[PDB]
Design a protein around this ligand. Sequence first.
Ligand SMILES: Nc1ncnc2c1ncn2[C@@H]1O[C@H](COP(=O)(O)OP(=O)(O)OP(O)(O)=S)[C@@H](O)[C@H]1O
Ligand SMILES: [Mg+2]
Lengths: 135, 116
Amino acid sequence: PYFLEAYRPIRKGDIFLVRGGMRAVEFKVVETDPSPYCIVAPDTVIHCEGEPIKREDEEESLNEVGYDDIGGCRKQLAQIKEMVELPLRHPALFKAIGVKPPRGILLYGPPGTGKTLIARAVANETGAFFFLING
Amino acid sequence: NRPNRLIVDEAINEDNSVVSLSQPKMDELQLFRGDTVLLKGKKRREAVCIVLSDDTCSDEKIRMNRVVRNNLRVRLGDVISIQPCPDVKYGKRIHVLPIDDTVEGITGNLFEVYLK
Ligand SMILES: Nc1ncnc2c1ncn2[C@@H]1O[C@H](COP(=O)(O)OP(=O)(O)OP(O)(O)=S)[C@@H](O)[C@H]1O
Ligand SMILES: [Mg+2]
């Protein structure tokens, strides 16, 4: 049901994600005859045989947390992005301004509201080195 | 002994090259609001400024900026002799250099923004 009534333009060098069956699975387009890219037709044949291979050392996983896994707190997530995204994405450009950044943020709420989730998602979606300290 | 000996007071006029004196001291030295005086300080170093007038100034003191104060190797409470210098000479070539710890974020042009 993935390619049916889809006409998905694929290309050699793409990894796509299929959900269903209480499981998310990642496939990689290894070889196509119309290189590099082609639209999947009903004329196509898909040879899904072969052994599963490992991950390239630089390909990040879609199992880890991004902004999509967070729901219900759009305003606070936008406020944290406005606080933190500019001193991380542009370090040296902000260094030459003369403006002090924030240097400590305190998240609070009832237990179970997803604070570790928000911290890890803002960590991974900016490329910053994330160190964890547990009390 | 001499009426030109003065003690440093704080700065009110926020211009760098402006010193200030009181009214009867300037009337005793016969100056004007557009003159050019010279200040002698410690470690055989001097500074040239533009003298103006001030009514809130005290009797035997002088008001100057922290820039002029640090260019004379002088702190608050020291002594300075003032002398007139009518040698009005126009410059021809000015060669200046920036300091590295204050330019470590900026590059390229400095003449049009800062000095112009
Ligand atoms: N806003 C949310 N969106 C999506 N999943 C959430 C959200 N809040 C909680 N969850 C889920 O519930 C789990 C618990 O989140 P936690 O980060 O443990 O919350 P918490 O604030 O850390 O609770 P404590 O005080 O640390 S025990 C998460 O790992 C998610 O699976
Ligand atoms: Mg937690």
